[PDB]
Structures are given as C-alpha cells and as structure tokens.
Amino acid sequence: HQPLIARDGPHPVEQPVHNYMTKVIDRRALNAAFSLATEAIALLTGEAL
Amino acid sequence: WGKDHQVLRLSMENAVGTVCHPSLMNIDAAVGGVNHDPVEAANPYGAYV
Amino acid sequence: CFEADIAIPSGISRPDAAALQRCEGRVVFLPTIRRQLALADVAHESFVSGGVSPDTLGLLLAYRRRFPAVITRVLPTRIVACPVDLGLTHAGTVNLRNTSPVDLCNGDPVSLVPPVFEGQATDVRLESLDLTLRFPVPLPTPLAREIVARLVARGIRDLNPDPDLNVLYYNGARLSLVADVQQLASVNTELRSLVLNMVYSITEGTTLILTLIPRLLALGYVNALLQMQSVTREAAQLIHPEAPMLMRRLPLYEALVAWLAHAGQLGDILALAPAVRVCTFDGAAVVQSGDMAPVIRYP
Amino acid sequence: CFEADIAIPSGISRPDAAALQRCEGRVVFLPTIRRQLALADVAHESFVSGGVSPDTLGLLLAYRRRFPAVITRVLPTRIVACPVDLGLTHAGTVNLRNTSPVDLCNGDPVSLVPPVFEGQATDVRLESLDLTLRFPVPLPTPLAREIVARLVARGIRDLNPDRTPGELPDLNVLYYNGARLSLVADVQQLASVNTELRSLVLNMVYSITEGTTLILTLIPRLLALSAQDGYVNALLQMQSVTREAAQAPMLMQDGERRLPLYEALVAWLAHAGQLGDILALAPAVRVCTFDGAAVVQSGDMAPVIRYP
Numbered sequence: 114h115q116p117l118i119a120r121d122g123p124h125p126v127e128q129p130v131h132n133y134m135t136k137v138i139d140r141r142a143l144n145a146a147f148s149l150a151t152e153a154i155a156l157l158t159g160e161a162l
Numbered sequence: 163w164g165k166d167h168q169v170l171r172l173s174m175e176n177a178v179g180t181v182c183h184p185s186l187m188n189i190d191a192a193v194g195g196v197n198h199d200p201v202e203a204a205n206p207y208g209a210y211v
Numbered sequence: 212c213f214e215a216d217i218a219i220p221s222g223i224s225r226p227d228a229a230a231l232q233r234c235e236g237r238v239v240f241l242p243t244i245r246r247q248l249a250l251a252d253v254a255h256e257s258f259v260s261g262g263v264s265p266d267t268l269g270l271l272l273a274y275r276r277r278f279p280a281v282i283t284r285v286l287p288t289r290i291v292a293c294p295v296d297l298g299l300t301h302a303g304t305v306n307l308r309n310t311s312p313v314d315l316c317n318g319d320p321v322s323l324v325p326p327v328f329e330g331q332a333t334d335v336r337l338e339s340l341d342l343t344l345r346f347p348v349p350l351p352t353p354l355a356r357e358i359v360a361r362l363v364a365r366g367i368r369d370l371n372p373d374p375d376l377n378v379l380y381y382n383g384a385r386l387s388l389v390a391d392v393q394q395l396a397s398v399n400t401e402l403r404s405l406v407l408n409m410v411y412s413i414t415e416g417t418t419l420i421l422t423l424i425p426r427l428l429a430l431g432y433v434n435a436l437l438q439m440q441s442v443t444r445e446a447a448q449l450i451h452p453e454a455p456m457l458m459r460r461l462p463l464y465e466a467l468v469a470w471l472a473h474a475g476q477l478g479d480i481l482a483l484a485p486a487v488r489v490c491t492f493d494g495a496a497v498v499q500s501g502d503m504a505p506v507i508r509y510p
Numbered sequence: 511c512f513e514a515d516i517a518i519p520s521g522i523s524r525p526d527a528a529a530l531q532r533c534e535g536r537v538v539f540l541p542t543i544r545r546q547l548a549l550a551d552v553a554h555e556s557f558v559s560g561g562v563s564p565d566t567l568g569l570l571l572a573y574r575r576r577f578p579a580v581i582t583r584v585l586p587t588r589i590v591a592c593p594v595d596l597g598l599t600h601a602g603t604v605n606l607r608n609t610s611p612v613d614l615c616n617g618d619p620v621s622l623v624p625p626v627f628e629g630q631a632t633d634v635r636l637e638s639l640d641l642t643l644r645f646p647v648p649l650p651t652p653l654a655r656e657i658v659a660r661l662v663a664r665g666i667r668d669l670n671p672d673r674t675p676g677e678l679p680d681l682n683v684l685y686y687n688g689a690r691l692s693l694v695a696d697v698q699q700l701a702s703v704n705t706e707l708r709s710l711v712l713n714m715v716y717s718i719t720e721g722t723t724l725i726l727t728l729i730p731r732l733l734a735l736s737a738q739d740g741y742v743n744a745l746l747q748m749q750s751v752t753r754e755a756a757q758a759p760m761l762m763q764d765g766e767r768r769l770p771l772y773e774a775l776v777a778w779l780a781h782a783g784q785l786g787d788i789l790a791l792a793p794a795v796r797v798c799t800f801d802g803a804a805v806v807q808s809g810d811m812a813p814v815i816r817y818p
Contacts, residue, residue: 123245123252125802202677243616245802275818276617278798296798296815299599360779364771367724371731374767404741409775410732411745411752413717413725416782418755420714427711430670432704437711445715452726455758464667465679466751471659471785476652478783479619484818509816 212303215241215280217248217290224339228287234335235285236308236503237346238322238486239292240277250290254342255334268405270324271480274347279322279486281305281506295486300509307487307506309498310348312381316496319485319510321355322347326401327362329390352485352510354381359483361388362398366406369399412477415470418456421449423463485510512597514540514579516589519549522638527586529634534584535607535811536645537622538591539576549589553641566694567661567702569624573646573791578622580604580814594794598816603798605811610647612686614806619793619818621654621786622646626661628692648812651793653686655786660684660693662710662789665703709788717782721770727758793818 115130155161164170217239219231239253251257258265258273265273280292283305293305307320311328314320325333325345336343350358358379365376365388379386389395424445428434438446487506489498498504516538518530538552550556557564557572564572579591582604592604608614611627625632625647634643649657664681672678684691733756735742746753786792797806798815806812 121247123249123802126245128801200677203675243802243804244798244800246800278617297603298601300816360775361772364769364775367728367771370728374769376769376772407732407735407742407745410725410728412782413722413774413778414729414732414755415750415752416714416778417718417722417726418729419751420711420718422751422755424711427666427670430673433707436708441715445718448718448722451723451760455760456726456729457755457757459754460667460670460672460674461679462749462754463751464663464681466747466749468656468659468663468681469747469749470751471662471789472652472656474782475655475784475786478779478786479651479818481779481783 212283212293212305213244213297214283214291214293215244215246215248217241217250217253217292219288219290220250220340222339223337227337227339230335230337231285231290234290234344234346235282236306237282237344238279238295238307238349239282239290239344239346240274240279241292241294242277244278244294244297250340251342253290253344255345256342266404267324267326267401268408268480270326271405271483274322274324275480279347281307295508298508301488301490301507304490304505304507306503307349307489307498309500309502309504310346310350311500312350312354312386313500314349314351314489314498314504315382316491317489318351318353319488320349320506321352321483321485322349323355323359323483324348326398327358330394330397330401352483355483356481358388359481362402363406363409366399366402367410370406370410408473408477412470412474415466416474417448417452419463419467419470420445421452422458423467425449426460426463511592511600512543513582513590513592514544514547514597516540516547516549516552516591518587518589519639522636526636526638529636530584530589533634533643533645534581535605536581536609537606537648538579538581538589538643539573539646540579540591540593541576543577543593543596549639550641552643554644555641557644562699565697565699565702566624566626567665567706568699569644570658570661570790571702571705573622573624578646578791578794580606598794603800603813603815606648606795606797606814608648608806608808608810608812609645610649610808611689611691612649612653613808614648614650614797614812616797616799616804617818618650618652619796620648620812620814621651621791621793623649623654623657623790626657626693628694630694651786651818653684654790656684657693658786658790662703662706664695665698666707668698669703669707706789710785713781713785713788717778717780719770719774719777721772721774722778723758723760724771725774729756 115132117127117129120127149157241248242252242257255264258270260269260273278294278296280294282290282292284291293303307314310333325348328348333346333348334343335346361376361379377388379388390398424437424441428437487508488510489504490507491498491505494505518527522530540547541551541556554563557569559568577593577595579593581589581591583590592598592600594604598604606620609632614620623646625644627647632644632647634645636642660681667678667681682693682695684693729752732742732746732752736746736753737743794817795814796816796818797812799806799813
C-alpha cells in the first residue's frame with residue numbers, strides 16, 4: 114500500500130494506490146548416487162560366509 | 163594485440179572464406195522479398211533496353 | 212450541481228472586485244472540470260493558441276472544446292461556476308443573464324463568441340491582475356445559427372464586392388447587426404478566417420462532385436438513379452459551373468478524403484449545439500435583455 | 511439509469527468467464543431497448559444479415575441501426591450495460607474503456623468504429639457457447655470521420671473501377687499525432703458501398719443551390735490568397751481539386767430580394783456539413799475527466815459525458 118501527497122495546484126488529485134501480486138514457487142531437484150560391487154552385495158547378505 | 167602481446171594482423175586476404183563463397187551471388191530472397199507491394203513507374207530510362 | 216470554485220488571484224483593486232460582482236450569471240468556459248481552478252485558466256488570455264488571440268473561428272473551436280459553466284455566486288477570493296455539461300439533463304436550474312434578444316420561455320440558448328456583436332463591448336478588463344474576460348452571448352439556437360450564417364455571407368460579399376443582411380427583425384423591434392463605424396472592419400477581420408474555410412469548403416465541394424459525377428456513372432444502379440432525380444439540378448449545375456470554370460480519379464479520391472474531413476469539422480464548429488434550454492415557472496416567460504433567466508441543462 | 515441486463519447463457523468455460531470479466535467498459539450494440547435480453551442478440555452472430563457477415567462498411571451501417579451500450583458491470587449471470595442512446599442520464603459519467611492506439615484528450619467527442627487497424631485485438635471467442643464479440647473502437651470524431659472517408663473512398667475508387675494503371679494512392683494509412691495508423695483493407699461489398707456512395711452523392715447535390723454559383727465566382731479570388739498569405743495557403747491542400755478547378759454571376763437574379771448567399775450557406779451546412787454523421791454514427795459521448803487528468807492513455811478508462 115502506498116502513501117500519497119495531498120497537492121495544491123493544477124496537478125491532478127491523487128488516489129491511494131493499493132497493490133496485489135503473487136509469485137510462483139520454482140522447483141529443482143538434487144541427485145547423488147553410489148554403487149555396490151557384486152562381490153560386496155554377495156557379502157552384505159549372507160551368501161559367502 | 164592478441165592475448166599475450168603477440169601483435170597480430172587481420173588483412174583483407176582473411177575475408178576470402180567469406181566473400182569468395184557463392185553466398186555472395188545469391189539474391190533471390192532480396193528481389194523476391196522486396197517485390198511485394200508493387201512500386202511506382204520510374205521513368206525506366208536507364209532501366210530499359 | 213457540482214460547483215467548481217475558481218480562485219481569484221492576489222489583491223485586486225476595489226473597482227475590479229466590483230467588476231466581478233457584476234459578472235454573476237455569465238457563462239465561463241473552464242478547460243477541465245477540476246474542482247479547484249485558477250482565474251488565469253478561464254481568462255481570455257488563456258485562449259491564445261498560435262501565439263495570437265483567437266479569431267471568431269479560433270474561439271468557436273475552443274467553445275466546443277472546454278466546458279461552459281454559468282457563474283452562480285461570485286465571492287471575494289472565489290468564483291463559483293457550475294458546469295453546464297455535468298449532471299442529469301433537465302436539472303440544476305441556474306440563472307443566466309440575457310444579452311440582446313429576449314430569450315423566450317424556451318429555445319435552447321447557444322453561447323456564441325462575443326465579436327458577432329459589439330466587439331470589445333463585454334471584454335470586462337481587470338487591470339489589477341492584468342487579465343480579461345469575454346463572455347459569450349446567450350442567443351437562441353434558431354437565431355444564433357441565422358446570425359452566424361448571416362455574417363459569413365456578408366463576409367463573402369465583402370471578400371469581393373463592387374439587400375441588407377444586417378437588418379434583423381426579431382420579436383418586437385428590428386434588431387441591428389451593423390454597429391457601422393469600423394466595428395464592421397473589426398467584425399469582418401475576425402470572421403476573415405471563418406469566411407475562407409466556408410468559401411473553400413464550398414468551392415472544394417462542388418468542383419469535387421462536379422468532377423466525380425461525370426467521372427462516375429460511366430464505370431449500374433448508380434448511373435440510372437443518380438441522373439434520375441438529378442435531372443436539371445446536378446447536371447445543369449455541372450454544365451453551368453464547368454462553363455465558368457475549368458474541369459483524375461487518383462487525386463480525386465485523395466482529395467475527396469481531405470475535403471470530407473474538413474467539411475464535417477466545419478459542421479461541428481458551426482451549428483452551435485445548444486448548451487441549455489430555458490424552462491421558466493412563476494416567471495415572466497420572456498426574459499428581457501439584461502435580466503437573469505432560468506435555464507436547464509439539456510435542450 | 512435504465513440499465514439493460516444481458517444474461518450469460520449456460521456456462522462459458524472458466525477461461526471464457528475470465529474473458530468477460532475484462533470486457534467491462536467496452537461497448538455493445540443491442541437491437542432494441544430492453545430489460546430482458548439474450549446474450550446471443552449482442553453477439554457478432556447477430557450482426558450476420560441473411561447468410562452473410564457484413565464487411566467493415568456493413569458494420570457501420572449495422573451500428574447505425576441498433577443502440578450502443580457501454581458495459582458498466584458484469585455479474586455471474588448477467589451483463590449490465592446502460593444504453594447511451596437513451597439511458598445516458600447519470601449524474602456523473604459512465605466509464606468508457608479506451609480500446610484504440612489513439613488517445614482521447616479532454617472534450618473529444620467519441621464516436622465508435624468497427625475494429626479497423628492493421629494490428630488489432632477484437633476477437634474474444636467464447637467456446638462454451640457458440641458466440642463472439644467484436645467490440646467497436648472508440649475514437650475522436652475528427653479521426654473517426656477521417657477513417658470512414660478512407661473506407662468510403664476505398665470502396666468507391668475501386669468500384670469505378672480505375673482504366674488508369676494498377677497502382678493507386680494509399681488511402682489505407684492515416685496519422686494521428688505521430689503514429690502511422692494502417693487501416694485494414696479486406697473486402698468491400700456491393701450493398702455496403704452502394705448506400706455509402708448513394709448517400710454521399712445524394713447529400714453533396716442538395717448542398718448546391720442558386721446562390722452557390724455566386725460562391726464559385728470566388729475560386730480565382732481564393733487562389734489570389736493561395737499565394738499572398740501564409741494561411742489560406744495552408745487552407746488549400748496541395749491536392750486540391752479547387753486548385754485544378756481554376757486551371758460568372760449570370761445575371762438571373764429573381765427580383766433581388768431572396769438573399770441567396772445566406773440561403774446557400776444554410777443549404778450547404780445542413781446536407782454537406784453533416785456528412786460524418788450520416789456516413790457514420792455521430793458522437794454521443796465526449797471525454798470528461800473530473801480528476802483533472804487531461805488525456806486518456808490507450809487501454810485506460812475514459813470518464814465520459816453526454817453528447818458534445
């Protein structure tokens with residue numbers, strides 16, 4: 114909401130301006146990864162022991 | 163001056179890859195692109211054989 | 212009523228303040244309907260356009276572009292004038308002042324430029340603040356149009372000269388147009404520019420139709436119907452003007468455009484559309500010259 | 511204010527209802543003075559004469575008939591527009607939305623025009639119910655009368671049909687202040703050009719009288735002023751037939767007391783003076799701004815007051 118200045122002279126008489134807006138949320142993603150060798154997966158669950 | 167001092171020299175022989183190509187002699191777009199909206203009768207004095 | 216309050220400038224002489232007091236009931240043209248306006252904006256020095264004070268044509272232009280407002284109350288340090296164009300029609304009766312012919316119980320007064328009558332008479336100068344006010348004359352529409360056309364014709368005769376248009380009989384006594392003297396030389400010099408736009412728009416209109424009709428109907432129902440009702444009227448006028456005159460579709464059509472505009476611009480200036488009507492009640496029914504008259508916003 | 515309600519039929523897609531929300535301040539032509547009316551009587555589908563859509567000189571003749579109404583407010587099931595031709599009696603000044611490249615100024619009488627510019631946006635298609643809305647372009651009468659003259663002459667010269675070579679003058683392009691304005695040149699229809707030509711020819715004849723010949727005497731006198739005044743020099747347009755018309759009383763005065771000059775002016779002033787009005791629709795409104803803003807930007811709302 115914006116102020117005014119009451120003003121004499123021929124300058125046009127001024128209305129209070131009210132103002133309205135919306136901004137749209139913007140999106141992304143992150144990603145990382147990793148891996149397991151087949152000889153590790155064999156170990157990590159039983160298997161080999 | 164190029165990068166690292168190196169005083170350099172562009173010369174006209176340098177333009178051979180540009181103006182020595184048969185891109186120079188093609189105007190079909192021009193003459194056909196300026197053709198629309200027919201022009202006034204010009205006293206085709208030097209324009210007539 | 213929507214009063215708009217014009218602000219009198221700084222200290223004015225006592226005889227000037229009495230000049231304004233006598234200006235209640237006079238028509239003002241106010242450039243914008245802003246509630247607060249200056250006096251210099253209304254004064255005739257604000258009609259300057261091309262670096263000159265406007266002629267009768269330049270005035271009639273301005274009278275069609277700004278808003279006339281009758282003066283209701285003049286107060287020291289304020290003038291209160293209520294614009295004629297604003298509000299509902301047939302409401303806001305505000306009193307006028309009659310100038311010249313009577314203004315009977317109706318007839319829709321037009322406010323026409325002052326010079327048409329005693330020129331400087333009504334200038335009402337204010338020396339203290341160095342400004343001036345020319346108030347338009349409130350005449351009825353039939354008479355206002357009769358006059359403004361009556362003077363243009365006199366002007367044409369005067370343009371090249373080698374039955375008096377001047378004597379006017381209105382109501383009870385013969386009205387007078389001519390103030391003789393050099394007033395005519397002052398009246399005729401201000402109508403000078405209105406006369407020409409009139410002379411031009413005629414001569415340019417005929418020659419443009421007289422060239423077009425024979426350069427059309429020779430290229431259907433156009434032909435037959437045209438020459439049908441034009442028998443011995445348009446065609447006769449064609450042979451007669453072409454007799455005492457000279458004779459191009461391409462310049463024709465482009466001149467028919469420029470004329471058609473200039474023409475209607477004169478019909479707008481001219482015809483002095485009525486600002487107000489008189490509707491009285493418990494009133495005399497005829498307002499004698501110089502007497503306040505009731506008046507309402509639409510014809 | 512004798513407002514005329516206009517019922518929105520069924521449901522026009524939320525995108526269509528959002529299109530009508532921004533149509534407030536625009537102008538509608540209704541084919542009656544009513545209290546109850548259907549949305550489809552206003553649509554451009556109603557402008558269609560038998561089998562055919564009128565051209566852009568046909569619309570002017572259609573806007574000649576029926577009544578311009580400026581939309582005041584739009585409600586979910588009705589459109590409120592007060593018919594300026596009648597219900598203009600408001601204390602203050604209904605809002606007109608300037609839709610035009612042009613700009614009003616203050617005091618400019620406003621006459622309307624079918625959309626006519628090269629770049630324009632007057633479609634407003636509403637898909638839910640088959641109908642559309644072309645909104646007329648408000649415009650100062652000086653400019654709107656220059657346009658109609660352009661459309662009339664363009665429909666006419668083409669009709670001769672100019673014999674002379676195939677390259678004619680522009681007549682399709684204007685200027686208002688700066689800003690070249692390019693009219694739409696598209697179709698001209700027999701009947702639409704006939705009436706416009708018929709009434710043009712008809713009225714320019716009635717403006718010629720006996721006293722007129724007294725004025726035609728003055729053409730050589732005009733050109734004497736062409737050349738020794740800077741005004742009167744300007745008056746005569748370069749393409750002036752009058753200039754080519756010079757490149758006389760005839761006695762015949764019927765008793766000498768008629769005053770044919772005066773009578774010739776009156777006659778010309780009626781018929782020829784009022785040609786913008788008969789060829790097109792005359793102004794019924796004029797810009798007035800209470801806040802003292804002295805122009806109206808294109809796209810803004812112009813406070814408007816009754817007839818000039």
